[PDB]
Structures are given as C-alpha cells and as structure tokens.
Amino acid sequence: TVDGLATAVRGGDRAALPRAITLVESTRPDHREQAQQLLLRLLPDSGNAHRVGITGVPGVGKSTAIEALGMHLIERGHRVAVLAVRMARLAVHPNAYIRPSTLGGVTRATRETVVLLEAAGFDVILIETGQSEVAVANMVDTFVLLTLARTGDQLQGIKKGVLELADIVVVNKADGEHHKEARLAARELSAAIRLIYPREALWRPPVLTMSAVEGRGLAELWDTVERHRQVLTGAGEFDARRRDQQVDWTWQLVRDAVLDRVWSNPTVRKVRSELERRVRAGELTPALAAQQILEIANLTD
C-alpha cells in the first residue's frame, strides 16, 4: 500500500497526506525505508512549486506576514503550504496546509515533507525558521529576510552572516510613527547590499518596506519573489540551484551518518569533557585527542 499511498497523494486524497507526512517524520528503521520508497514514487510529481524561506528575529512579524502572504496567494489561485523549522485565518482554507516542526532530523523531515506536498498539488511552499537559517536557505528557491524598520537597528538580534543568505530583504513594521524612518532604514540596507554585491549582474537583493499587520507590501513582496524566479530561470540558475542543493544534501546525509557513529557513542560522550579540558589547557594536542576519540569510538562500536 506504498504504491497505493503514492497514487492517493498524487490524486489529491487529503487524509493520505498527513499519514505520508507521519511516515516521513518517523525514524523507526522500518518506516524510513518505506518512506524512501514512497518519496521515490512521488519524486517525479514534485518540483512544480516555488519554495520560499522566511526568517528574522522573534517578534519581527514573521507569522503575521506569512498569514497575509498566504491569503494573498490563495486568493490568486495557489495552494499554499507553511512549514516551520499563530496564523488561524489561513489554516481554515481548504487550499492551505500548516504543519508544526536535532537539526539534521528536522531538516530531513522538512525536505521530505516538501516532496510530498508538491506531489500533492501545493504550488507554493513557505518555510519559516540555531544553524537553522542555512538549512532552510539550502532547501528553498528564494530566501527572504525580514528586519525591523528602524534606522540603524534593522539587523538587531540577527546572527551575522544571515544577511548574505537573503535573496530579498524586507524592512517590516513600516507603519505608525515610522513611515519615513522605514524608507531611510531600507535605503541604509540597500547601501550595505550594494557594498556586499558591488558588481553583481544577475540578482542583487532588493530591499522592500512592508507593514505585514496593515497588509501593506505583501503583494510587492510576492511580485519580487516571482521576479527572482523569472530572472534565475532566464539564466538557467533556478534548476541549477535545486540540483546543487540535492547533491549537497546527499553528501550531508553521508556526513551525518558517518559522524553520528562517533558523536552518538556513549563512551565518546562520557570522556568528552576531560579530553576537551585537556585540549583547552594545552595538556594534549588536538591531533592526539582526535585519535583518542576515534580509538575509543572504535572500541565500543
């Protein structure tokens, strides 16, 4: 009934999707293996969606923007899924799907859930965010960064480096007392994006203003998301980026499988503090501690 579970998802049965999602989220050894066979069957029905990541600090307005962008999209004929690596009026619609979420684990489960959703007819996948930003950037076509409409304080609370992940930057809460400040805060971020992408010819991250609580700027945000994709498609980079993500994910799964044998080893985990204390104190070289970790892992595996 895995062959059966695949025709039901592809045919649009909507009690079968939660179950296939449950199967994909399971890690019991018997489940991963059928989860794999299902994905394999549904994979050629995937890929026909725009995957958008969305990040920014708690309270920047992420879930308010997603709810509104979700409504905007549904009213335009899309079927929208929201995943997390809050929004009630979205969740009511028969054309929306909202599901709540170890980074390797949740990445795997999210990634595999996307294949299911795309096979199931969803054409827009919104994925909301520790090292979780990179993980989501690596599984989406357009990575969106929401920031604060405060001149000199846009990236408050943002891990450094995250700005370079963004295909689009959005100065949110451009309302109330900060209509004019929003514009200046945006122009400040543009200036910086211009220094970080000084001779980019294909896509330099545009910076938008938004008021996700007043529903202002979501349409323009989406117009920009579509534009990102027409630009990348016209240069052959859109499929090229996806194929490169799937190859990097493959090598990452290989990396995780082979390193978890070590990291996950109980003996390695008891002895870890002491070998580290010794390294930090220069009582032991890192090559020698590394060897000891390996010998020990190898004795108890």
Ligand X SMILES: Nc1nc2c(ncn2[C@@H]2O[C@H](COP(=O)(O)OP(=O)(O)O)[C@@H](O)[C@H]2O)c(=O)[nH]1
Interface residues toward its own copies, by CB under 8 A: 32, 36, 39-40, 43-44, 46-47, 108, 112, 152-156, 160-161, 163-164, 188-189, 191-192, 194-199, 243, 246-247, 249-251, 253-255, 257-259, 261-262, 275-276, 279-280, 282, 284-290, 293-294
Taking the least distance from each CB to its own copies, the nearer of 46 and 95 is 46
Build a one-symbol-per-residue string for 51-90: x at contacts with ligand X by CB under 6 A, - elsewhere: -------xxxxxxx--------------------------
- Ligand-binding site membership of 63 (annotated): yes
Query: Which option in ligand X, its own copies, none does residue 3 bind, with CB closer than 5 to 8 A by kind?
Result: none
- Ligand-binding site membership of 300 (annotated): no
- The least CB distance from residue 106 to its own copies, in Å, is 15
Question: Quick one: 117 exposed, middle or buried, by C-beta within 10 A (0-12, 13-18, 19+)?
Answer: buried
* β strands within the chain, DSSP E: 50-55, 80-84, 96-99, 124-128, 142-148, 168-172, 207-209
Query: Which option in ligand X, its own copies, none does residue 91 bind, with CB closer than 5 to 8 A by kind?
Result: none
- Residue 213 binding ligand X, by CB under 6 A: yes
Which residues have C-beta within 8 Å of that of residue 21, sequence separation ≥ 6? 99, 113, 116
- Ligand-binding site membership of 57 (annotated): yes
**How big is the CA angle at 152 (ends 147 and 158), to the nearest 5 degrees?**
40
- The single residue among 13, 175, 220, 237 that binds ligand X, judged by CB under 6 A, is 175
Taking the least distance from each CB to ligand X, the nearer of 6 and 87 is 87
Q: Whole-angstrom Cα distance, residue 226 to residue 245?
A: 20
Residue that the structure tokens 């108890």 belong to: 300
Query: Which option in its own copies, ligand X, none does residue 173 bind, with CB closer than 5 to 8 A by kind?
Result: ligand X
Query: Which option in ligand X, its own copies, none does residue 94 bind, with CB closer than 5 to 8 A by kind?
Result: none
End-to-end CA distance of the chain: 36
- The single residue among 10, 79, 111, 173 that binds ligand X, judged by CB under 6 A, is 173
Q: Which residue is nearest to ligand X (CB)?
A: 61
Taking the least distance from each CB to its own copies, the nearer of 18 and 152 is 152
- The single residue among 113, 151, 172, 209 that binds ligand X, judged by CB under 6 A, is 172
Number of residues that bind ligand X (CB under 6 A): 14
- Residue 212 binding ligand X, by CB under 6 A: yes
- Ligand-binding site membership of 132 (annotated): no
Whole-number CA gyration radius for the chain = 22
Q: Is the dihedral of CA 238, 241, 247, 249 positive or negative?
A: negative
Query: Which option in ligand X, its own copies, none does residue 50 bind, with CB closer than 5 to 8 A by kind?
Result: none
Q: Whole-angstrom Cα distance, residue 275 to residue 294?
A: 12
Q: Whole-angstrom Cα distance, residue 154 to residue 170?
A: 10
In the chain, count of helices (H) and strands (E)? 12, 7
- Ligand-binding site membership of 211 (annotated): yes
Q: Whole-angstrom Cα distance, residue 1 to residue 5?
A: 6
CB-based contact 136:144 (threshold 8 Å): no
- Ligand-binding site membership of 213 (annotated): yes
- Ligand-binding site membership of 59 (annotated): yes
At residue 283, the 3 state secondary structure works out as: coil
Question: Among the residues of 26-119, which ranges form H helices?
Answer: 29-42, 62-74, 88-91, 103-119
Residues found near ligand X in the complex (CB under 6 A): 58-64, 172-173, 175-176, 211-213
- Going by the annotation, the residues of the binding site are 56-64, 175, 211-213
